[PDB]
Amino acid sequence: GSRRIFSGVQPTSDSLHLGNALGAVAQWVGLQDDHDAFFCVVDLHAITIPQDPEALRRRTLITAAQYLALGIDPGRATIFVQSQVPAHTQLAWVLGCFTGFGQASRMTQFKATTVGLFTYPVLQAADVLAYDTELVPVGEDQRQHLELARDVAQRFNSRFPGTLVVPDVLIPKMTAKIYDLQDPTSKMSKSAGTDAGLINLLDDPALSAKKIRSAVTDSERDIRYDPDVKPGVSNLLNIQSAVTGTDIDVLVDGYAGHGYGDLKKDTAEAVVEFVNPIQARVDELTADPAELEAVLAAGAQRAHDVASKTVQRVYDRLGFLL
Amino acid sequence: GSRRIFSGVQPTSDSLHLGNALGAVAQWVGLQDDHDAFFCVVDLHAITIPQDPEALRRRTLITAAQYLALGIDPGRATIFVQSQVPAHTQLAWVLGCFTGFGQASRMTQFKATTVGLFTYPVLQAADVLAYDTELVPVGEDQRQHLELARDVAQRFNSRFPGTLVVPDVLIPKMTAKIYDLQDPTSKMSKSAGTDAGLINLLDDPALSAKKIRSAVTDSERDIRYDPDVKPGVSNLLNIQSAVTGTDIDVLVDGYAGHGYGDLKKDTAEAVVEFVNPIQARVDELTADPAELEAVLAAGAQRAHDVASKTVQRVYDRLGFLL
Ligand SMILES: Nc1ncnc2c1ncn2[C@@H]1O[C@H](COP(=O)(O)OP(=O)(O)OP(=O)(O)O)[C@@H](O)[C@H]1O
Ligand SMILES: Nc1ncnc2c1ncn2[C@@H]1O[C@H](COP(=O)(O)OP(=O)(O)OP(=O)(O)O)[C@@H](O)[C@H]1O
Ligand SMILES: CNC1=NC(=O)[C@H]([C@H](C)c2c[nH]c3cccc(Cl)c23)O1
Ligand SMILES: CNC1=NC(=O)[C@H]([C@H](C)c2c[nH]c3cccc(Cl)c23)O1
Ligand SMILES: [Mg+2]
Ligand SMILES: [Mg+2]
């Protein structure tokens, strides 16, 4: 329970992309050694959009496998599937009763729609608050969601002091947003349309290298870090720095006198070396699922033990008959 | 599982009124002998409005006690508290993903707001659909809610054939709407403002008799059944017929030559005889709670055994990892 953290990714495709891996999971890996961590595959969130059932099940497992292959350690952290812990939807109903309609209407994605698309930020708040979470490591695109979660927790604690932990949001600087390679002002997302700007962890590594070589850059022939003036170039530097461990300024210094072909070739090569061991791990975890299944089953038990107590505390404060 | 029915009442006050008792529970009592029945105290719904916790717990028990005192038979039916069965909120989240935003926006109460006030019709659909319910006995004010429930079930079964039972709505004719005694065009409701037009089951019987004697009537000095021309008079006849078992036309025939004082005096007396045995039963169930508690605990177990299987069927169809 020391420095408890919570985070999750939707099983909405066959592969995470660099945004997920560098903007979220890489932070998780650094945090798990000294933080008590719950890492969730949020399959309940996935069905806000129609999902093919066979694919949804398959992608749930492969999202968890990508956690292990990115270095999440089941001996140090808990990995579980959202839908296996009923407390999430129980708390979501309670929190929705403390969430203003206008609050939810102002959320960016909503602001065709279903109730699920309207209320998922409330389920997201429940996902975090159910585990007495102290810190939430996400990318920048989640900031507005977790401000709602903090507001609703404080509004609830107003009525019922000390019931819910109010979580701090932990959003990195450099990898807060990995951008699409074909449109470097737009964040890398699973729905860019064409995925030529999208780098998937489990895609054929030469296809990813090819996409990096075609990355949009500028006209200045000057490798320097300036995301607002030089989006493409700064993104590439961000990617290379993130997958290598080399600081951006050390890279920019080494790139003095170099052109953009050298920047793309080096980033392509670094990414290829990044994803090759990931793909080998995921392949084995898919071919031999017993290991992954035991991890998720232990995770669910642990998650349930924690989450159910939070729900019973909340229910007791509200005055429900227990 | 034969002719399975489901219905519920909110624990939002210290007493049901005649609307609840005649428009809903009286139908339940007639149905329970040859229908497999689940009767629910829907405490999750109550918190869409802020509730005092001590009161909420106390009113949950007293709503269940009023079920027993109105004749619900724990040997023939299941009585349970909504919040004790997690399946309700699990299915509510799924169904919300199949509910149009405009669908929910068109609901009468919504059409100040919270997400809970916006989404409670979806939780109501889950309440019913979780038990493979074939028939839902409600008053007229619930018709639009249960049309949503039927639509969402059919929309879900469209994707996933045969997963959910589509319930038939069972709404009585005469007691579909018991009207307020001071405003006979408005339905008896817990929030009329002044409760001089509201007849509570557990109020002092002489206070209720006094309210009936002050009931708004017309100017014609003619006792006949015509709800659109004679709202007050038709309501009184509806009430007397419902609490006595005497058909309306037999009563109207007996009232030939009589004035409205006779109608109010007879209805007051019939209601007093109705509520006196109810109050005696509820008093004992409040003073000695062991009986009620065992009923609700057995009910929760039974409800859970059924509802959890529905959720697992739904989850399997969606493609969740089980
Ligand atoms: N381009 C990105 N850069 C950095 N972090 C990202 C990026 N995209 C997503 N993330 C992070 O990944 C986590 C989970 O996001 P999610 O599962 O919604 O992935 P997504 O790529 O946004 O998928 P979708 O397009 O289906 O929403 C969040 O912490 C989010 O901030
Ligand atoms: N005036 C009425 N006449 C007939 N039936 C009624 C009346 N009011 C409520 N009912 C029935 O009672 C059941 C439960 O309703 P509910 O718990 O919402 O009571 P309510 O009186 O409407 O309380 P509230 O004012 O808090 O909504 C429903 O089946 C509803 O149709
Ligand atoms: C459509 N649903 C949806 N879109 C989002 O971006 C969020 C994310 C995926 C999320 C859910 N629960 C969490 C708990 C912690 C951190 C996060 Cl990032 C989440 O939910
Ligand atoms: C604010 N919430 C709310 N208002 C209503 O009128 C409905 C009712 C009380 C209800 C909930 N679940 C049910 C299952 C079956 C039948 C009924 Cl009547 C209900 O819910
Ligand atoms: Mg997203
Ligand atoms: Mg009502």
GROMACS .gro file of N, CA, C and O and ligand atoms in nm, chain A residues 7-10 12 17-20 22-24 137-142 175-179 187-191, ligand 1:
model
  143
    7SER      N    1  -0.297   0.236  -1.320
    7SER     CA    2  -0.307   0.286  -1.457
    7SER      C    3  -0.363   0.174  -1.544
    7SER      O    4  -0.365   0.057  -1.506
    8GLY      N    5  -0.409   0.211  -1.663
    8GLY     CA    6  -0.466   0.111  -1.751
    8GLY      C    7  -0.462   0.152  -1.896
    8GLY      O    8  -0.450   0.270  -1.929
    9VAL      N    9  -0.475   0.051  -1.983
    9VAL     CA   10  -0.478   0.068  -2.128
    9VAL      C   11  -0.594  -0.014  -2.183
    9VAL      O   12  -0.623  -0.123  -2.134
   10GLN      N   13  -0.658   0.036  -2.286
   10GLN     CA   14  -0.774  -0.032  -2.345
   10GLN      C   15  -0.730  -0.143  -2.440
   10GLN      O   16  -0.642  -0.121  -2.524
   12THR      N   17  -0.807  -0.233  -2.731
   12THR     CA   18  -0.881  -0.197  -2.851
   12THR      C   19  -0.806  -0.227  -2.980
   12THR      O   20  -0.860  -0.201  -3.088
   17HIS      N   21   0.100   0.109  -2.940
   17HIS     CA   22   0.191   0.188  -3.021
   17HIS      C   23   0.290   0.260  -2.931
   17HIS      O   24   0.287   0.247  -2.808
   18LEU      N   25   0.381   0.336  -2.992
   18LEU     CA   26   0.488   0.397  -2.914
   18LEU      C   27   0.434   0.496  -2.811
   18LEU      O   28   0.491   0.511  -2.703
   19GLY      N   29   0.324   0.564  -2.844
   19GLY     CA   30   0.259   0.650  -2.746
   19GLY      C   31   0.229   0.577  -2.616
   19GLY      O   32   0.265   0.623  -2.508
   20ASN      N   33   0.163   0.461  -2.625
   20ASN     CA   34   0.133   0.384  -2.505
   20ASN      C   35   0.259   0.337  -2.436
   20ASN      O   36   0.270   0.341  -2.313
   22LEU      N   37   0.583   0.440  -2.456
   22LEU     CA   38   0.672   0.541  -2.400
   22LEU      C   39   0.599   0.640  -2.311
   22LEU      O   40   0.653   0.682  -2.208
   23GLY      N   41   0.474   0.676  -2.344
   23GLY     CA   42   0.403   0.773  -2.263
   23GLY      C   43   0.342   0.719  -2.136
   23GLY      O   44   0.312   0.797  -2.045
   24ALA      N   45   0.323   0.587  -2.127
   24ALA     CA   46   0.262   0.527  -2.009
   24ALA      C   47   0.345   0.413  -1.952
   24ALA      O   48   0.396   0.424  -1.840
  137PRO      N   49  -0.008   0.729  -1.324
  137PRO     CA   50   0.086   0.763  -1.432
  137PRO      C   51   0.023   0.748  -1.569
  137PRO      O   52   0.000   0.636  -1.615
  138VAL      N   53  -0.005   0.860  -1.636
  138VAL     CA   54  -0.070   0.861  -1.766
  138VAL      C   55   0.003   0.957  -1.858
  138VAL      O   56   0.089   1.034  -1.817
  139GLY      N   57  -0.035   0.953  -1.985
  139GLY     CA   58   0.003   1.058  -2.076
  139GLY      C   59  -0.087   1.180  -2.065
  139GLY      O   60  -0.190   1.180  -1.995
  140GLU      N   61  -0.048   1.284  -2.139
  140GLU     CA   62  -0.111   1.416  -2.129
  140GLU      C   63  -0.259   1.412  -2.167
  140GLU      O   64  -0.339   1.488  -2.110
  141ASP      N   65  -0.297   1.326  -2.262
  141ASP     CA   66  -0.435   1.314  -2.309
  141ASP      C   67  -0.532   1.271  -2.199
  141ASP      O   68  -0.653   1.280  -2.221
  142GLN      N   69  -0.484   1.226  -2.084
  142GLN     CA   70  -0.571   1.184  -1.975
  142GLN      C   71  -0.588   1.290  -1.868
  142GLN      O   72  -0.661   1.266  -1.771
  175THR      N   73   0.785   1.247  -2.299
  175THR     CA   74   0.700   1.146  -2.360
  175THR      C   75   0.551   1.166  -2.331
  175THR      O   76   0.472   1.074  -2.353
  176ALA      N   77   0.512   1.285  -2.281
  176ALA     CA   78   0.371   1.313  -2.254
  176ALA      C   79   0.284   1.291  -2.377
  176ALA      O   80   0.165   1.258  -2.364
  177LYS      N   81   0.343   1.307  -2.496
  177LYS     CA   82   0.271   1.297  -2.623
  177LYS      C   83   0.373   1.252  -2.728
  177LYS      O   84   0.461   1.330  -2.765
  178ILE      N   85   0.363   1.127  -2.773
  178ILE     CA   86   0.433   1.087  -2.895
  178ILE      C   87   0.342   1.119  -3.013
  178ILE      O   88   0.225   1.080  -3.015
  179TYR      N   89   0.396   1.189  -3.112
  179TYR     CA   90   0.314   1.235  -3.223
  179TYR      C   91   0.316   1.138  -3.341
  179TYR      O   92   0.410   1.059  -3.358
  187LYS      N   93  -0.147   1.361  -3.205
  187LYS     CA   94  -0.094   1.255  -3.120
  187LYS      C   95  -0.107   1.120  -3.189
  187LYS      O   96  -0.203   1.095  -3.262
  188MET      N   97  -0.010   1.032  -3.167
  188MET     CA   98  -0.022   0.895  -3.216
  188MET      C   99  -0.142   0.829  -3.152
  188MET      O  100  -0.150   0.820  -3.029
  189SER      N  101  -0.237   0.785  -3.234
  189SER     CA  102  -0.359   0.722  -3.187
  189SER      C  103  -0.396   0.606  -3.278
  189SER      O  104  -0.364   0.606  -3.397
  190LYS      N  105  -0.467   0.509  -3.221
  190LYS     CA  106  -0.511   0.392  -3.298
  190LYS      C  107  -0.607   0.428  -3.411
  190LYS      O  108  -0.625   0.348  -3.503
  191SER      N  109  -0.667   0.547  -3.409
  191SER     CA  110  -0.760   0.585  -3.515
  191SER      C  111  -0.712   0.706  -3.595
  191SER      O  112  -0.788   0.803  -3.613
  645LIG     N1  113   0.029   0.948  -2.843
  645LIG     C1  114   0.045   0.921  -2.711
  645LIG     N2  115   0.150   0.968  -2.643
  645LIG     C2  116   0.168   0.942  -2.512
  645LIG     N3  117   0.083   0.869  -2.440
  645LIG     C3  118  -0.028   0.816  -2.497
  645LIG     C4  119  -0.054   0.839  -2.638
  645LIG     N4  120  -0.170   0.776  -2.668
  645LIG     C5  121  -0.214   0.716  -2.555
  645LIG     N5  122  -0.129   0.740  -2.453
  645LIG     C6  123  -0.145   0.691  -2.316
  645LIG     O1  124  -0.179   0.551  -2.315
  645LIG     C7  125  -0.267   0.524  -2.204
  645LIG     C8  126  -0.390   0.441  -2.243
  645LIG     O2  127  -0.452   0.501  -2.355
  645LIG     P1  128  -0.555   0.426  -2.454
  645LIG     O3  129  -0.572   0.281  -2.420
  645LIG     O4  130  -0.674   0.518  -2.468
  645LIG     O5  131  -0.464   0.428  -2.588
  645LIG     P2  132  -0.497   0.517  -2.718
  645LIG     O6  133  -0.378   0.510  -2.810
  645LIG     O7  134  -0.545   0.654  -2.677
  645LIG     O8  135  -0.613   0.425  -2.782
  645LIG     P3  136  -0.750   0.482  -2.845
  645LIG     O9  137  -0.710   0.553  -2.972
  645LIG    O10  138  -0.824   0.352  -2.862
  645LIG    O11  139  -0.808   0.576  -2.741
  645LIG     C9  140  -0.303   0.659  -2.144
  645LIG    O12  141  -0.216   0.675  -2.033
  645LIG    C10  142  -0.263   0.760  -2.251
  645LIG    O13  143  -0.229   0.889  -2.198
   0.00000   0.00000   0.00000
